[PDB]
Scaffold this active site. Structure first.
Site, PDB file in Angstrom:
ATOM      1  N   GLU A 192      71.682 120.437  24.613  1.00 19.00           N
ATOM      2  CA  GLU A 192      70.709 121.494  24.854  1.00 19.00           C
ATOM      3  C   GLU A 192      70.595 121.910  26.324  1.00 19.00           C
ATOM      4  O   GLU A 192      69.533 122.406  26.717  1.00 19.00           O
ATOM      5  CB  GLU A 192      69.335 121.054  24.354  1.00 19.00           C
ATOM      6  CG  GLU A 192      68.756 119.895  25.181  1.00 19.00           C
ATOM      7  CD  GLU A 192      68.936 118.524  24.520  1.00 19.00           C
ATOM      8  OE1 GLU A 192      69.907 118.339  23.743  1.00 19.00           O
ATOM      9  OE2 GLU A 192      68.096 117.616  24.776  1.00 19.00           O
ATOM     10  N   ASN A 193      71.644 121.762  27.143  1.00 20.21           N
ATOM     11  CA  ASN A 193      71.501 122.059  28.570  1.00 20.21           C
ATOM     12  C   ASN A 193      70.789 123.393  28.754  1.00 20.21           C
ATOM     13  O   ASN A 193      71.132 124.386  28.107  1.00 20.21           O
ATOM     14  CB  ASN A 193      72.864 122.106  29.274  1.00 20.21           C
ATOM     15  CG  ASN A 193      73.778 120.986  28.851  1.00 20.21           C
ATOM     16  OD1 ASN A 193      73.609 119.833  29.257  1.00 20.21           O
ATOM     17  ND2 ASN A 193      74.752 121.313  28.017  1.00 20.21           N
TER      18      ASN A 193
ATOM     19  N   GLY B 171      77.305 116.471  18.389  1.00 21.14           N
ATOM     20  CA  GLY B 171      77.408 117.751  17.720  1.00 21.14           C
ATOM     21  C   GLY B 171      77.219 118.887  18.704  1.00 21.14           C
ATOM     22  O   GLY B 171      77.907 119.913  18.618  1.00 21.14           O
ATOM     23  N   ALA B 172      76.296 118.710  19.649  1.00 19.43           N
ATOM     24  CA  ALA B 172      75.913 119.769  20.585  1.00 19.43           C
ATOM     25  C   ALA B 172      74.975 119.174  21.631  1.00 19.43           C
ATOM     26  O   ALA B 172      74.601 118.004  21.552  1.00 19.43           O
ATOM     27  CB  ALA B 172      75.253 120.947  19.853  1.00 19.43           C
TER      28      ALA B 172
ATOM     29  N   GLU C 253      73.667 114.007  29.348  1.00 20.12           N
ATOM     30  CA  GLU C 253      72.678 113.168  28.664  1.00 20.12           C
ATOM     31  C   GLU C 253      73.370 111.984  28.000  1.00 20.12           C
ATOM     32  O   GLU C 253      74.380 112.164  27.317  1.00 20.12           O
ATOM     33  CB  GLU C 253      71.885 113.963  27.621  1.00 20.12           C
ATOM     34  CG  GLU C 253      70.603 113.234  27.192  1.00 20.12           C
ATOM     35  CD  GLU C 253      69.801 113.974  26.141  1.00 20.12           C
ATOM     36  OE1 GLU C 253      70.340 114.916  25.526  1.00 20.12           O
ATOM     37  OE2 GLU C 253      68.611 113.623  25.930  1.00 20.12           O
TER      38      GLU C 253
ATOM     39  N   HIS D 230      68.280 123.549  16.260  1.00 22.43           N
ATOM     40  CA  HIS D 230      67.996 122.296  16.956  1.00 22.43           C
ATOM     41  C   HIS D 230      68.113 122.470  18.468  1.00 22.43           C
ATOM     42  O   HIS D 230      67.225 122.068  19.222  1.00 22.43           O
ATOM     43  CB  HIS D 230      68.967 121.220  16.458  1.00 22.43           C
ATOM     44  CG  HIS D 230      68.719 119.857  17.021  1.00 22.43           C
ATOM     45  ND1 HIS D 230      68.038 118.880  16.324  1.00 22.43           N
ATOM     46  CD2 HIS D 230      69.086 119.294  18.201  1.00 22.43           C
ATOM     47  CE1 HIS D 230      67.981 117.779  17.055  1.00 22.43           C
ATOM     48  NE2 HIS D 230      68.620 117.998  18.195  1.00 22.43           N
ATOM     49  N   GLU D 231      69.218 123.053  18.936  1.00 25.43           N
ATOM     50  CA  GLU D 231      69.405 123.185  20.379  1.00 25.43           C
ATOM     51  C   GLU D 231      68.366 124.123  20.993  1.00 25.43           C
ATOM     52  O   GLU D 231      67.889 123.887  22.105  1.00 25.43           O
ATOM     53  CB  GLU D 231      70.821 123.670  20.682  1.00 25.43           C
ATOM     54  CG  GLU D 231      71.878 122.744  20.136  1.00 25.43           C
ATOM     55  CD  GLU D 231      71.648 121.320  20.570  1.00 25.43           C
ATOM     56  OE1 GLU D 231      71.349 121.122  21.758  1.00 25.43           O
ATOM     57  OE2 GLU D 231      71.748 120.410  19.721  1.00 25.43           O
TER      58      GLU D 231
ATOM     59  N   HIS E  33      65.020 122.409  21.487  1.00 22.03           N
ATOM     60  CA  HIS E  33      65.057 121.565  22.678  1.00 22.03           C
ATOM     61  C   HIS E  33      64.627 122.319  23.927  1.00 22.03           C
ATOM     62  O   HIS E  33      64.158 121.702  24.891  1.00 22.03           O
ATOM     63  CB  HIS E  33      66.477 121.020  22.878  1.00 22.03           C
ATOM     64  CG  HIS E  33      66.713 119.687  22.238  1.00 22.03           C
ATOM     65  ND1 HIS E  33      65.798 118.661  22.297  1.00 22.03           N
ATOM     66  CD2 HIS E  33      67.780 119.204  21.549  1.00 22.03           C
ATOM     67  CE1 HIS E  33      66.284 117.604  21.671  1.00 22.03           C
ATOM     68  NE2 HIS E  33      67.487 117.905  21.209  1.00 22.03           N
TER      69      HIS E  33
ATOM     70  N   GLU F 102      63.849 114.219  20.349  1.00 19.61           N
ATOM     71  CA  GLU F 102      64.810 114.344  19.250  1.00 19.61           C
ATOM     72  C   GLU F 102      64.112 114.467  17.902  1.00 19.61           C
ATOM     73  O   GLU F 102      64.566 115.218  17.028  1.00 19.61           O
ATOM     74  CB  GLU F 102      65.774 113.154  19.252  1.00 19.61           C
ATOM     75  CG  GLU F 102      66.746 113.142  20.457  1.00 19.61           C
ATOM     76  CD  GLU F 102      67.495 114.448  20.595  1.00 19.61           C
ATOM     77  OE1 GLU F 102      67.471 115.221  19.623  1.00 19.61           O
ATOM     78  OE2 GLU F 102      68.085 114.701  21.660  1.00 19.61           O
TER      79      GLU F 102
HETATM   80 ZN    ZN Z   1      68.610 116.802  19.855  1.00 14.16          ZN
END
Ligand code: ZN
Ligand SMILES: *[C@@H]1O[C@H](CO)[C@@H](O[C@@H]2O[C@H](CO)[C@@H](O[C@@H]3O[C@H](CO)[C@@H](O)[C@H](O[C@H]4O[C@H](CO)[C@@H](O)[C@H](O)[C@@H]4O)[C@@H]3O)[C@H](O)[C@H]2NC(C)=O)[C@H](O)[C@H]1NC(C)=O
Ligand SMILES: *[C@@H]1O[C@H](CO)[C@@H](O[C@@H]2O[C@H](CO)[C@@H](O)[C@H](O)[C@H]2NC(C)=O)[C@H](O[C@@H]2O[C@@H](C)[C@@H](O)[C@@H](O)[C@@H]2O)[C@H]1NC(C)=O
Ligand SMILES: *[C@@H]1O[C@H](CO)[C@@H](O[C@@H]2O[C@H](CO)[C@@H](O)[C@H](O)[C@H]2NC(C)=O)[C@H](O)[C@H]1NC(C)=O
Ligand code: NAG
Ligand code: NA
Ligand code: NA
Ligand code: NA
Ligand code: NA
Lengths: 862, 9
Positions: free
Chosen positions: A275-276, A272-273, A138, A308-309, A312, A331
């Protein structure tokens, strides 16, 4: 002669399914691929345009299916590197509606950046270097790993195959279903086909990671993966992930559709991370928790990051924005859902109390002419990366919270559930969301004012007896007429006679409401749930100031923080004098709660950061002395322990750091004693985590203490401890040591390059390091852009972190002159426009207010 | 993700 001259792909060739074969080599740092993509065309075309970036295409062929009638033909390959496209020219035009399969063989090099299919490294506890390969696609980097229709609305299923050495593990989005030895020392891993999803969610990792796992009540296998030496730090995140995934499944009544969910801690990671779908990835510091060394804020952050992830998986993966202009649908929702979910799963964290701070973060950028509407057009990859900003995340979440309060949680939730069900495995636009909310009140007109105009309103309140007059105007920094912006503003207020939240929808420039009885005071924007600021005419601010100084408990902690923030925002537009705002801040002498204390710091610290970069040491020193005297009673009550709630621990840590940094002798002497003992223990002493920032920051002020801290950094396995040491080392006043930190983290060997943006900004904030950091950014710009990419928040952080505390015309010209010289390699960055506007405001603000502050400090009203 | 600076406590 490239036959397509637009950045966006043609709309009339659509993929259905990809088979991806990837053969990586972690010794030679290369990879080979075969991509098969099943396509159909809605228009007769003899050309197929798709995305490919830094891949060497060796052959492309077109196949026309049918058991016995299956035919195959070669495609001519053209490339347009700046459009990041290739063109495959067929001998005969494709027949509309029939299935074709495009087969592309290609090679590439593992990326040396943090995107694409990239190299990550770490050292064994014995010093041995290890190499792994991981992905970050992404927004627009899938095309660096395989040729594809690399836009989020071209959804398809993916069957992924990975060829690897026996000694390594491969993981991907889906479970591994078969491993087949294909040659000597080569195993081919087959992963199950994915659901329909966007190209940017494809993921795979080749590593020697270890894992821990736990099964959800719905039967999903959740695992955390990490390097062997750190897998014993995975327990907290594993437990949080199971609880949060179960929450979302039960909350939306929409199950997670995959059999497993992995959380992988990558030793090098830019964001930070990510979300795959089925294989979420993280900075080690965003996932791994050490019970002895991690801070309260890191535990909070891990919990919110996992939340958060996992959000997603619904807001982003199941339902995806149609194009990056509406990235906020991913987001903003994911950011908002952190608070919806964790407020239930971890109620001891009281996270709802912190939410309004995100809104004030958004307002910092959103007060500038160089902000942008939440939904706004973008085209090229740099502009797309620029959408991952505080407007998409924080304003996005804030206007969702505002809308939820307006509609009520139950009506809001019903709308979101219908939205997710209707658009499952599809893509959405701004307007689709409003349609779903309305199906449950003209949500669309209201929310268009909050998503299609930048900025936010100033609401001005004028009371005449029982008559409460309201006015809205556009808040525009630098000081009263504006471009006729207008919002549908869901106002709220309380009064001296009613702490029920009262509601009024202001849809026009002016309006009025009539109170039932006269009141002693009125306070709008209750809890700071609305994305707007408030000015009170006549005696309003005097009266609210007396309220804060007499019984500051008449309104909530977040209402007090909102008054602090708004008062100082009104200074910058000339609606309140700096002296009146500073007078209000004196009530903090008796404040105890973290949000208003932190809000006071957020308004006052930037003032002396400006002074630090000027010839202003006497006023700077007096101002800092004022700040410490203001909070001294609260500082003095802090224990040097890890006791209390997460809020008590975060408040303690920041107050002790503040006191030590400003040379408050009682705190400095305690920090010096702890640091001396820590050093005498050879670093074996367990310090209270909550005092360690202060202790390290004081210890790093001498050469021997700095050198000793760095000597311990090598061997630490704790992300919190490494962050604390980095912070301390960047606080030294030794300029040659500061230069060393920039050089070494830029190199990435002793300090990982993923820390460089933070280190550059911390030195940029250092009262003696700021010239060095700005010089370093100019000198090393091209390599930093190559590593981090134009439009990335990394670059934006570096730009703002080295320049946005300047406040002179000469510094402004340095900034304008440098970034102008970059032409197509930086001159048009939005962060550059934002920092220039910030410097322009700093100049005006200091010119107007510096002597006023000097005189106010002399009045010693404290 | 964007907001990754909470380790620095
Ligand atoms: Zn996000
Ligand atoms: C990544 O690239 C590296 C380097 O290019 C590559 O390492 C090489 O792997 C091959 C095969 O695993 C190694 O060659 C083998 O060595 C063993 C031990 O000596 C032999 O038993 C093997 O011989 C058998 O198979 C041969 C087939 O070629 C036959 O000719 C033979 O008669 C036997 O049947 C074979 O020679 C080679 O030593 C390494 N090279 C290095 C420098 O390490 C690695 O495999 C690549 N990985 C991937 C996934 O592509
Ligand atoms: C102080 O030094 C001790 C000796 O090296 C540390 O104990 C050692 O910690 C290693 C890493 O956790 C572990 O592999 C060793 O088995 C262990 N050795 C012994 C003799 O206990 C100690 O680390 C703390 O104490 C141990 C028992 C564990 O609880 C660790 O998690 C602790 O951090 C060192 N203490 C500190 C604060 O560094
Ligand atoms: C990966 O890097 C290698 C560098 O080792 C590139 O290989 C060179 O490519 C140029 C241009 O095609 C050739 O003139 C050189 O002879 C190549 N060097 C070698 C040693 O073969 C390769 O092109 C890169 N791959 C990609 C996809 O960019
Ligand atoms: C804001 O930016 C636009 C576009 O650059 C410009 O037309 C306008 O004058 C700017 N406003 C101010 C106050 O500079
Ligand atoms: Na409140
Ligand atoms: Na409100
Ligand atoms: Na950004
Ligand atoms: Na970064």
């Amino acid at each position: 002669p490239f036959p397509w001259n637009k950045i966006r792909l043609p709309e009339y060739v659509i993929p259905v399914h990809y088979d991806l074969l990837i053969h990586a080599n972690l010794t030679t740092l290369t990879f080979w691929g075969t991509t098969k993509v099943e396509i159909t065309a809605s228009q007769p075309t003899s050309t197929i345009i798709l995305h490919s970036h830094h891949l060497q295409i060796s052959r492309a062929t077109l196949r026309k299916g049918a058991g016995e009638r299956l035919s195959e033909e070669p495609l001519q390959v053209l490339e347009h590197p700046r459009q990041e496209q290739i063109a495959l020219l067929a001998p005969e035009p494709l027949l509309v509606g029939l299935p074709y399969t495009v087969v592309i063989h290609y090679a590439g090099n593992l990326s040396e950046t943090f995107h694409g299919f990239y190299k990550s490294t770490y050292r064994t506890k014995e010093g041995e270097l290890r190499i792994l390969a991981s992905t970050q696609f992404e927004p627009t980097a899938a095309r660096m790993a395989f040729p594809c229709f690399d836009e989020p609305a071209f959804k398809a299923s993916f069957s992924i195959k990975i060829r690897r050495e026996p000694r390594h593990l491969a993981i991907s989005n889906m479970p591994l279903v078969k491993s087949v030895t294909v040659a000597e020392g080569l195993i081919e891993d087959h992963f199950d086909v994915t659901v329909k999803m966007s190209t940017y969610l494809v993921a795979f990792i080749i590593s020697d990671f270890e894992s821990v796992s736990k099964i959800t009540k719905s039967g999903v296998k959740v695992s955390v993966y990490a390097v062997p030496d750190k897998i014993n730090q995975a327990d907290y995140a594993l437990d949080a992930a199971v609880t949060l995934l179960e929450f979302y499944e039960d909350y939306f009544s929409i199950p997670y559709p995959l059999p497993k969910q992995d959380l992988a801690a990558i030793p090098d990671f830019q964001s930070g991370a990510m979300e795959n779908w089925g294989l979420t990835t993280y900075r080690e510091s965003a996932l791994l928790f050490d019970a002895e060394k991690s801070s309260a804020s890191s535990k909070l952050g891990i919990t919110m990051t996992v939340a958060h992830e996992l959000a997603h998986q619904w807001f982003g993966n199941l339902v995806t924005m149609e194009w990056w202009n509406d990235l906020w649908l991913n987001e903003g929702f994911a950011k908002f859902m952190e608070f919806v979910s964790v407020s239930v799963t971890h109620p001891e964290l009281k996270v709802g109390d912190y939410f309004f701070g995100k809104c004030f973060d958004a307002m910092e950028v959103d007060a500038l002419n160089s902000s942008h509407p939440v939904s706004t057009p973008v085209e090229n990859p740099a502009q797309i990366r620029e959408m991952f900003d505080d407007v998409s995340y924080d304003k996005g979440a804030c206007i969702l919270n505002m809308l939820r309060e307006y509609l009520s949680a139950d009506a809001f939730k019903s709308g979101i559930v219908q939205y997710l069900q209707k658009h499952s495995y599809k893509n959405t636009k701004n307007e689709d969301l409003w349609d779903s909310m309305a199906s449950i009140v003209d949500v669309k007109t209201m929310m268009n004012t909050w998503t299609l105009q930048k900025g936010f309103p100033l609401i001005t309140i004028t009371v005449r007896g029982r008559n409460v007059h309201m006015k809205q105007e556009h808040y525009m920094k630098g000081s009263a007429p504006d471009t006729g912006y207008l919002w549908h503003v869901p106002l709220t207020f309380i009064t001296s006679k009613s702490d029920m939240v009262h509601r009024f929808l202001l849809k026009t420039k002016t309006d009025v409401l009539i109170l039932p009885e006269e009141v002693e005071w009125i306070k709008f924007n209750v809890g700071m749930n609305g994305y707007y600021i408030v000015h009170y005419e006549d005696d309003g601010w005097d009266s609210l100031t007396g309220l804060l100084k007499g019984t500051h408990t008449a309104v909530s902690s977040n209402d007090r923080a909102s008054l602090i923030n708004n008062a100082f925002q009104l200074v910058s537009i000339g609606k309140l004098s700096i002296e009146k705002a500073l007078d209000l801040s004196l009530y903090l002498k008796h404040e105890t709660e973290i949000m208003p204390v932190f809000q006071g710091l957020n308004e006052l610290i930037p003032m002396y950061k400006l002074m630090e970069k000027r010839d202003m040491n006497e006023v700077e020193t007096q101002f800092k002395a004022f700040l410490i005297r203001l909070l001294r009673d609260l500082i003095d009550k802090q224990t040097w322990t890890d006791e209390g709630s997460v809020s008590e621990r975060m408040l303690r840590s920041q107050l002790l750091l503040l006191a030590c940094v400003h040379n408050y002798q009682p705190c400095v002497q305690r920090a010096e004693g702890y640091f001396r003992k820590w050093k005498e223990s050879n670093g074996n002493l367990s310090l209270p985590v909550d005092v360690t920032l202060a202790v390290f920051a004081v210890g790093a002020q001498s050469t021997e203490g700095w050198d000793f801290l760095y000597s311990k950094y090598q061997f630490s396995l704790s992300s919190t401890e490494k962050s604390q040491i980095e912070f301390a080392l960047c606080r030294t006043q030794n300029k040659e040591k500061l230069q060393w930190l920039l050089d070494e983290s830029f190199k990435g060997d002793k300090i990982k390059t993923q820390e460089f943006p933070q280190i550059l900004t911390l030195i940029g904030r250092n009262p003696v390091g700021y010239p060095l950091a700005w010089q370093f950014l100019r000198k090393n710009w091209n390599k930093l852009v190559q590593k981090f990419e134009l439009g990335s928040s990394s670059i934006a952080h570096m730009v703002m972190g080295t320049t946005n505390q300047f406040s002179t015309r000469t510094r402004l010209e340095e900034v304008k002159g440098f970034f102008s010289s970059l032409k197509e390699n930086g001159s048009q960055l939005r962060c550059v426009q934002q920092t220039i506007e910030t410097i322009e405001e700093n100049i005006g603000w200091m010119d107007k207010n510096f002597d006023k502050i000097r005189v106010w400090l002399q009045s010693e009203k404290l | 993700x964007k907001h990754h600076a909470f380790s620095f406590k």
